[PDB]
PDB file of N, CA and C and ligand atoms in Angstrom:
ATOM      1  N   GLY V   1      89.731  87.651 115.874  1.00  0.00           N
ATOM      2  CA  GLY V   1      89.292  86.781 114.747  1.00  0.00           C
ATOM      3  C   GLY V   1      90.234  86.974 113.555  1.00  0.00           C
ATOM      4  N   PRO V   2      91.336  86.267 113.584  1.00  0.00           N
ATOM      5  CA  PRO V   2      92.328  86.367 112.485  1.00  0.00           C
ATOM      6  C   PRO V   2      91.805  85.667 111.228  1.00  0.00           C
ATOM      7  N   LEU V   3      91.915  86.305 110.094  1.00  0.00           N
ATOM      8  CA  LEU V   3      91.424  85.678 108.832  1.00  0.00           C
ATOM      9  C   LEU V   3      92.415  84.615 108.350  1.00  0.00           C
ATOM     10  N   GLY V   4      91.987  83.383 108.277  1.00  0.00           N
ATOM     11  CA  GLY V   4      92.901  82.299 107.815  1.00  0.00           C
ATOM     12  C   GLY V   4      93.309  82.558 106.364  1.00  0.00           C
ATOM     13  N   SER V   5      93.662  81.528 105.643  1.00  0.00           N
ATOM     14  CA  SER V   5      94.071  81.718 104.220  1.00  0.00           C
ATOM     15  C   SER V   5      93.293  80.759 103.310  1.00  0.00           C
ATOM     16  N   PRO V   6      91.988  80.817 103.403  1.00  0.00           N
ATOM     17  CA  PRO V   6      91.130  79.940 102.571  1.00  0.00           C
ATOM     18  C   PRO V   6      91.131  80.423 101.117  1.00  0.00           C
ATOM     19  N   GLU V   7      90.883  81.688 100.904  1.00  0.00           N
ATOM     20  CA  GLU V   7      90.869  82.226  99.512  1.00  0.00           C
ATOM     21  C   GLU V   7      92.216  82.879  99.186  1.00  0.00           C
ATOM     22  N   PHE V   8      92.238  83.784  98.242  1.00  0.00           N
ATOM     23  CA  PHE V   8      93.519  84.455  97.880  1.00  0.00           C
ATOM     24  C   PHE V   8      93.919  85.458  98.965  1.00  0.00           C
ATOM     25  N   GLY V   9      95.026  86.129  98.785  1.00  0.00           N
ATOM     26  CA  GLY V   9      95.475  87.123  99.803  1.00  0.00           C
ATOM     27  C   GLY V   9      96.861  87.648  99.424  1.00  0.00           C
ATOM     28  N   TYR V  10      97.707  87.881 100.392  1.00  0.00           N
ATOM     29  CA  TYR V  10      99.074  88.392 100.081  1.00  0.00           C
ATOM     30  C   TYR V  10     100.056  87.227  99.911  1.00  0.00           C
ATOM     31  N   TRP V  11      99.552  86.028  99.792  1.00  0.00           N
ATOM     32  CA  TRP V  11     100.448  84.850  99.613  1.00  0.00           C
ATOM     33  C   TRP V  11     100.827  84.716  98.136  1.00  0.00           C
ATOM     34  N   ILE V  12     101.431  85.734  97.578  1.00  0.00           N
ATOM     35  CA  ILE V  12     101.810  85.682  96.134  1.00  0.00           C
ATOM     36  C   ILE V  12     103.332  85.680  95.970  1.00  0.00           C
ATOM     37  N   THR V  13     103.804  86.020  94.798  1.00  0.00           N
ATOM     38  CA  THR V  13     105.273  86.042  94.558  1.00  0.00           C
ATOM     39  C   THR V  13     105.760  87.482  94.361  1.00  0.00           C
ATOM     40  N   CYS V  14     106.067  88.161  95.433  1.00  0.00           N
ATOM     41  CA  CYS V  14     106.563  89.569  95.331  1.00  0.00           C
ATOM     42  C   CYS V  14     107.731  89.652  94.336  1.00  0.00           C
ATOM     43  N   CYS V  15     108.430  88.564  94.144  1.00  0.00           N
ATOM     44  CA  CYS V  15     109.582  88.561  93.195  1.00  0.00           C
ATOM     45  C   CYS V  15     109.779  87.146  92.632  1.00  0.00           C
ATOM     46  N   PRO V  16     110.836  86.958  91.879  1.00  0.00           N
ATOM     47  CA  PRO V  16     111.108  85.628  91.290  1.00  0.00           C
ATOM     48  C   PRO V  16     111.720  84.694  92.339  1.00  0.00           C
ATOM     49  N   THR V  17     112.284  85.245  93.381  1.00  0.00           N
ATOM     50  CA  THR V  17     112.889  84.394  94.446  1.00  0.00           C
ATOM     51  C   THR V  17     112.191  84.665  95.781  1.00  0.00           C
ATOM     52  N   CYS V  18     110.903  84.879  95.748  1.00  0.00           N
ATOM     53  CA  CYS V  18     110.150  85.160  97.006  1.00  0.00           C
ATOM     54  C   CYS V  18     110.079  83.904  97.882  1.00  0.00           C
ATOM     55  N   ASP V  19     110.017  84.083  99.174  1.00  0.00           N
ATOM     56  CA  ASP V  19     109.940  82.910 100.094  1.00  0.00           C
ATOM     57  C   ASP V  19     108.761  83.061 101.067  1.00  0.00           C
ATOM     58  N   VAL V  20     108.067  84.171 101.020  1.00  0.00           N
ATOM     59  CA  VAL V  20     106.911  84.370 101.945  1.00  0.00           C
ATOM     60  C   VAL V  20     105.838  83.307 101.687  1.00  0.00           C
ATOM     61  N   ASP V  21     105.538  82.516 102.679  1.00  0.00           N
ATOM     62  CA  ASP V  21     104.501  81.458 102.513  1.00  0.00           C
ATOM     63  C   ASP V  21     103.957  81.056 103.885  1.00  0.00           C
ATOM     64  N   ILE V  22     102.682  81.241 104.111  1.00  0.00           N
ATOM     65  CA  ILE V  22     102.094  80.877 105.436  1.00  0.00           C
ATOM     66  C   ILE V  22     102.474  79.444 105.820  1.00  0.00           C
ATOM     67  N   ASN V  23     102.742  78.605 104.851  1.00  0.00           N
ATOM     68  CA  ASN V  23     103.138  77.201 105.174  1.00  0.00           C
ATOM     69  C   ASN V  23     104.314  77.220 106.155  1.00  0.00           C
ATOM     70  N   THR V  24     105.088  78.273 106.123  1.00  0.00           N
ATOM     71  CA  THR V  24     106.249  78.393 107.049  1.00  0.00           C
ATOM     72  C   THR V  24     106.499  79.870 107.382  1.00  0.00           C
ATOM     73  N   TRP V  25     105.514  80.713 107.184  1.00  0.00           N
ATOM     74  CA  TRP V  25     105.695  82.164 107.489  1.00  0.00           C
ATOM     75  C   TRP V  25     105.019  82.521 108.812  1.00  0.00           C
ATOM     76  N   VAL V  26     105.334  83.669 109.345  1.00  0.00           N
ATOM     77  CA  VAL V  26     104.711  84.108 110.626  1.00  0.00           C
ATOM     78  C   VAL V  26     104.753  85.638 110.722  1.00  0.00           C
ATOM     79  N   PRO V  27     104.008  86.180 111.654  1.00  0.00           N
ATOM     80  CA  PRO V  27     103.985  87.652 111.833  1.00  0.00           C
ATOM     81  C   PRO V  27     105.322  88.135 112.402  1.00  0.00           C
ATOM     82  N   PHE V  28     106.166  88.679 111.565  1.00  0.00           N
ATOM     83  CA  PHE V  28     107.493  89.167 112.042  1.00  0.00           C
ATOM     84  C   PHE V  28     107.392  90.628 112.484  1.00  0.00           C
ATOM     85  N   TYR V  29     106.632  91.415 111.775  1.00  0.00           N
ATOM     86  CA  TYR V  29     106.490  92.855 112.147  1.00  0.00           C
ATOM     87  C   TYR V  29     105.727  92.983 113.467  1.00  0.00           C
ATOM     88  N   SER V  30     106.036  93.986 114.244  1.00  0.00           N
ATOM     89  CA  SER V  30     105.333  94.168 115.548  1.00  0.00           C
ATOM     90  C   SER V  30     103.947  94.778 115.324  1.00  0.00           C
ATOM     91  N   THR V  31     103.773  95.507 114.254  1.00  0.00           N
ATOM     92  CA  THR V  31     102.444  96.130 113.983  1.00  0.00           C
ATOM     93  C   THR V  31     101.541  95.163 113.203  1.00  0.00           C
ATOM     94  N   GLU V  32     102.049  94.016 112.829  1.00  0.00           N
ATOM     95  CA  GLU V  32     101.211  93.040 112.073  1.00  0.00           C
ATOM     96  C   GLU V  32     100.719  91.931 113.008  1.00  0.00           C
ATOM     97  N   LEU V  33      99.726  91.189 112.593  1.00  0.00           N
ATOM     98  CA  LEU V  33      99.197  90.092 113.457  1.00  0.00           C
ATOM     99  C   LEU V  33      99.508  88.730 112.830  1.00  0.00           C
ATOM    100  N   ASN V  34      99.348  88.611 111.539  1.00  0.00           N
ATOM    101  CA  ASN V  34      99.632  87.309 110.866  1.00  0.00           C
ATOM    102  C   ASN V  34      99.665  87.497 109.347  1.00  0.00           C
ATOM    103  N   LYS V  35     100.206  88.593 108.887  1.00  0.00           N
ATOM    104  CA  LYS V  35     100.270  88.835 107.415  1.00  0.00           C
ATOM    105  C   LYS V  35     101.491  89.699 107.070  1.00  0.00           C
ATOM    106  N   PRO V  36     102.075  89.432 105.928  1.00  0.00           N
ATOM    107  CA  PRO V  36     103.265  90.201 105.484  1.00  0.00           C
ATOM    108  C   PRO V  36     102.877  91.632 105.098  1.00  0.00           C
ATOM    109  N   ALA V  37     103.495  92.608 105.706  1.00  0.00           N
ATOM    110  CA  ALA V  37     103.172  94.025 105.367  1.00  0.00           C
ATOM    111  C   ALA V  37     103.644  94.336 103.944  1.00  0.00           C
ATOM    112  N   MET V  38     102.888  93.933 102.958  1.00  0.00           N
ATOM    113  CA  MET V  38     103.294  94.191 101.544  1.00  0.00           C
ATOM    114  C   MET V  38     103.499  95.689 101.300  1.00  0.00           C
ATOM    115  N   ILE V  39     104.254  96.026 100.291  1.00  0.00           N
ATOM    116  CA  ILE V  39     104.504  97.460  99.974  1.00  0.00           C
ATOM    117  C   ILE V  39     104.199  97.720  98.496  1.00  0.00           C
ATOM    118  N   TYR V  40     103.808  98.920  98.159  1.00  0.00           N
ATOM    119  CA  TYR V  40     103.493  99.226  96.732  1.00  0.00           C
ATOM    120  C   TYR V  40     104.622 100.046  96.096  1.00  0.00           C
ATOM    121  N   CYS V  41     105.011  99.706  94.895  1.00  0.00           N
ATOM    122  CA  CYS V  41     106.104 100.465  94.218  1.00  0.00           C
ATOM    123  C   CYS V  41     105.519 101.632  93.417  1.00  0.00           C
ATOM    124  N   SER V  42     106.327 102.604  93.091  1.00  0.00           N
ATOM    125  CA  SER V  42     105.823 103.769  92.309  1.00  0.00           C
ATOM    126  C   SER V  42     106.709 104.005  91.083  1.00  0.00           C
ATOM    127  N   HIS V  43     107.254 102.955  90.527  1.00  0.00           N
ATOM    128  CA  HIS V  43     108.131 103.112  89.330  1.00  0.00           C
ATOM    129  C   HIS V  43     107.454 102.513  88.095  1.00  0.00           C
ATOM    130  N   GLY V  44     106.866 103.338  87.270  1.00  0.00           N
ATOM    131  CA  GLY V  44     106.189 102.819  86.047  1.00  0.00           C
ATOM    132  C   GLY V  44     105.029 101.906  86.449  1.00  0.00           C
ATOM    133  N   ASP V  45     105.262 100.622  86.495  1.00  0.00           N
ATOM    134  CA  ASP V  45     104.174  99.676  86.879  1.00  0.00           C
ATOM    135  C   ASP V  45     104.177  99.453  88.395  1.00  0.00           C
ATOM    136  N   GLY V  46     103.387 100.203  89.115  1.00  0.00           N
ATOM    137  CA  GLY V  46     103.342 100.036  90.596  1.00  0.00           C
ATOM    138  C   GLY V  46     102.799  98.647  90.935  1.00  0.00           C
ATOM    139  N   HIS V  47     103.528  97.888  91.709  1.00  0.00           N
ATOM    140  CA  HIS V  47     103.048  96.526  92.088  1.00  0.00           C
ATOM    141  C   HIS V  47     103.129  96.336  93.597  1.00  0.00           C
ATOM    142  N   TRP V  48     102.670  95.214  94.067  1.00  0.00           N
ATOM    143  CA  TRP V  48     102.698  94.940  95.528  1.00  0.00           C
ATOM    144  C   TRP V  48     103.702  93.824  95.837  1.00  0.00           C
ATOM    145  N   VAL V  49     104.530  94.011  96.833  1.00  0.00           N
ATOM    146  CA  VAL V  49     105.535  92.957  97.177  1.00  0.00           C
ATOM    147  C   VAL V  49     105.878  93.007  98.672  1.00  0.00           C
ATOM    148  N   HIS V  50     106.234  91.887  99.249  1.00  0.00           N
ATOM    149  CA  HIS V  50     106.579  91.861 100.705  1.00  0.00           C
ATOM    150  C   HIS V  50     107.768  92.784 100.985  1.00  0.00           C
ATOM    151  N   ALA V  51     107.978  93.138 102.225  1.00  0.00           N
ATOM    152  CA  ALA V  51     109.120  94.036 102.565  1.00  0.00           C
ATOM    153  C   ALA V  51     110.321  93.211 103.038  1.00  0.00           C
ATOM    154  N   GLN V  52     110.119  92.348 103.998  1.00  0.00           N
ATOM    155  CA  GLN V  52     111.249  91.512 104.506  1.00  0.00           C
ATOM    156  C   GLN V  52     111.862  90.692 103.365  1.00  0.00           C
ATOM    157  N   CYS V  53     111.099  90.421 102.339  1.00  0.00           N
ATOM    158  CA  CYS V  53     111.638  89.628 101.195  1.00  0.00           C
ATOM    159  C   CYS V  53     112.836  90.347 100.567  1.00  0.00           C
ATOM    160  N   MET V  54     112.934  91.637 100.757  1.00  0.00           N
ATOM    161  CA  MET V  54     114.078  92.396 100.168  1.00  0.00           C
ATOM    162  C   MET V  54     115.042  92.842 101.269  1.00  0.00           C
ATOM    163  N   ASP V  55     115.148  92.077 102.327  1.00  0.00           N
ATOM    164  CA  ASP V  55     116.072  92.451 103.442  1.00  0.00           C
ATOM    165  C   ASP V  55     115.804  93.887 103.905  1.00  0.00           C
ATOM    166  N   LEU V  56     114.573  94.204 104.206  1.00  0.00           N
ATOM    167  CA  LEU V  56     114.246  95.587 104.666  1.00  0.00           C
ATOM    168  C   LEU V  56     114.103  95.617 106.190  1.00  0.00           C
ATOM    169  N   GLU V  57     114.096  96.786 106.772  1.00  0.00           N
ATOM    170  CA  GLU V  57     113.958  96.884 108.254  1.00  0.00           C
ATOM    171  C   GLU V  57     112.506  97.185 108.632  1.00  0.00           C
ATOM    172  N   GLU V  58     112.063  96.695 109.760  1.00  0.00           N
ATOM    173  CA  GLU V  58     110.656  96.954 110.186  1.00  0.00           C
ATOM    174  C   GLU V  58     110.438  98.452 110.407  1.00  0.00           C
ATOM    175  N   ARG V  59     111.409  99.126 110.963  1.00  0.00           N
ATOM    176  CA  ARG V  59     111.260 100.592 111.206  1.00  0.00           C
ATOM    177  C   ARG V  59     111.077 101.330 109.879  1.00  0.00           C
ATOM    178  N   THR V  60     112.013 101.190 108.974  1.00  0.00           N
ATOM    179  CA  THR V  60     111.896 101.884 107.654  1.00  0.00           C
ATOM    180  C   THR V  60     110.495 101.682 107.069  1.00  0.00           C
ATOM    181  N   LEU V  61     109.954 100.499 107.193  1.00  0.00           N
ATOM    182  CA  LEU V  61     108.584 100.249 106.659  1.00  0.00           C
ATOM    183  C   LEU V  61     107.581 101.124 107.413  1.00  0.00           C
ATOM    184  N   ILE V  62     107.768 101.283 108.699  1.00  0.00           N
ATOM    185  CA  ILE V  62     106.838 102.147 109.480  1.00  0.00           C
ATOM    186  C   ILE V  62     107.001 103.588 109.005  1.00  0.00           C
ATOM    187  N   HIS V  63     108.222 104.040 108.940  1.00  0.00           N
ATOM    188  CA  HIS V  63     108.490 105.426 108.482  1.00  0.00           C
ATOM    189  C   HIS V  63     107.882 105.617 107.091  1.00  0.00           C
ATOM    190  N   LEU V  64     108.175 104.719 106.193  1.00  0.00           N
ATOM    191  CA  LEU V  64     107.619 104.824 104.815  1.00  0.00           C
ATOM    192  C   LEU V  64     106.091 104.701 104.848  1.00  0.00           C
ATOM    193  N   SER V  65     105.543 104.221 105.935  1.00  0.00           N
ATOM    194  CA  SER V  65     104.061 104.087 106.025  1.00  0.00           C
ATOM    195  C   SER V  65     103.443 105.370 106.596  1.00  0.00           C
ATOM    196  N   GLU V  66     104.224 106.412 106.736  1.00  0.00           N
ATOM    197  CA  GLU V  66     103.677 107.686 107.288  1.00  0.00           C
ATOM    198  C   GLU V  66     102.648 108.285 106.323  1.00  0.00           C
ATOM    199  N   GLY V  67     102.772 108.000 105.054  1.00  0.00           N
ATOM    200  CA  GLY V  67     101.800 108.550 104.067  1.00  0.00           C
ATOM    201  C   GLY V  67     102.555 109.146 102.876  1.00  0.00           C
ATOM    202  N   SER V  68     102.988 110.373 102.992  1.00  0.00           N
ATOM    203  CA  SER V  68     103.729 111.014 101.866  1.00  0.00           C
ATOM    204  C   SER V  68     105.180 110.523 101.837  1.00  0.00           C
ATOM    205  N   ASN V  69     105.495 109.634 100.934  1.00  0.00           N
ATOM    206  CA  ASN V  69     106.892 109.115 100.850  1.00  0.00           C
ATOM    207  C   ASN V  69     107.082 108.321  99.554  1.00  0.00           C
ATOM    208  N   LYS V  70     108.018 108.720  98.734  1.00  0.00           N
ATOM    209  CA  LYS V  70     108.256 107.987  97.456  1.00  0.00           C
ATOM    210  C   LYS V  70     108.746 106.567  97.751  1.00  0.00           C
ATOM    211  N   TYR V  71     107.844 105.660  98.015  1.00  0.00           N
ATOM    212  CA  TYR V  71     108.258 104.258  98.315  1.00  0.00           C
ATOM    213  C   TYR V  71     108.690 103.542  97.033  1.00  0.00           C
ATOM    214  N   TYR V  72     109.741 102.769  97.104  1.00  0.00           N
ATOM    215  CA  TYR V  72     110.218 102.036  95.895  1.00  0.00           C
ATOM    216  C   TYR V  72     110.590 100.597  96.264  1.00  0.00           C
ATOM    217  N   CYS V  73     110.140  99.641  95.495  1.00  0.00           N
ATOM    218  CA  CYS V  73     110.467  98.216  95.803  1.00  0.00           C
ATOM    219  C   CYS V  73     111.988  98.009  95.780  1.00  0.00           C
ATOM    220  N   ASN V  74     112.430  96.782  95.722  1.00  0.00           N
ATOM    221  CA  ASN V  74     113.900  96.515  95.697  1.00  0.00           C
ATOM    222  C   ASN V  74     114.413  96.445  94.253  1.00  0.00           C
ATOM    223  N   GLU V  75     113.619  95.928  93.353  1.00  0.00           N
ATOM    224  CA  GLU V  75     114.065  95.818  91.930  1.00  0.00           C
ATOM    225  C   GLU V  75     113.934  97.160  91.196  1.00  0.00           C
ATOM    226  N   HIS V  76     113.505  98.195  91.870  1.00  0.00           N
ATOM    227  CA  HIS V  76     113.365  99.517  91.193  1.00  0.00           C
ATOM    228  C   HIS V  76     113.939 100.630  92.075  1.00  0.00           C
ATOM    229  N   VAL V  77     114.875 100.302  92.927  1.00  0.00           N
ATOM    230  CA  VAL V  77     115.475 101.343  93.815  1.00  0.00           C
ATOM    231  C   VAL V  77     116.759 101.892  93.192  1.00  0.00           C
ATOM    232  N   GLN V  78     117.429 101.086  92.425  1.00  0.00           N
ATOM    233  CA  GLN V  78     118.694 101.537  91.776  1.00  0.00           C
ATOM    234  C   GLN V  78     118.888 100.815  90.439  1.00  0.00           C
ATOM    235  N   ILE V  79     117.941 100.937  89.548  1.00  0.00           N
ATOM    236  CA  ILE V  79     118.066 100.257  88.224  1.00  0.00           C
ATOM    237  C   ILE V  79     119.304 100.767  87.479  1.00  0.00           C
ATOM    238  N   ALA V  80     120.105  99.875  86.960  1.00  0.00           N
ATOM    239  CA  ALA V  80     121.329 100.305  86.223  1.00  0.00           C
ATOM    240  C   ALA V  80     121.845  99.162  85.344  1.00  0.00           C
ATOM    241  N   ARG V  81     122.473  98.187  85.939  1.00  0.00           N
ATOM    242  CA  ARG V  81     123.004  97.040  85.145  1.00  0.00           C
ATOM    243  C   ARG V  81     121.999  95.885  85.146  1.00  0.00           C
ATOM    244  N   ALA V  82     121.447  95.568  86.288  1.00  0.00           N
ATOM    245  CA  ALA V  82     120.460  94.452  86.359  1.00  0.00           C
ATOM    246  C   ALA V  82     119.665  94.532  87.665  1.00  0.00           C
TER     247      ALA V  82
HETATM  248 ZN1   ZN E 101     107.894  87.979  98.801  1.00  0.00          ZN
HETATM  249 ZN1   ZN E 102     108.963  98.056  91.942  1.00  0.00          ZN
END
């Protein structure tokens, strides 16, 4: 019984150039069924954002999902010039 997308969910804007949208999205991860494995950042304002949206690997997401791991989004992994 997969939950459709009637109400809100992870269909948001992980970034300013996000493309994740059920209108044309699908379960890419092998551990997922029909939803983007969003990730939480730990830099000042922790937020939620898709993983593939930042050119990430499915394995790294699994490893980072082990529990204890300083996970960092893409816009806060190497802040310096922009
Ligand atoms: Zn996104
Ligand atoms: Zn972040």
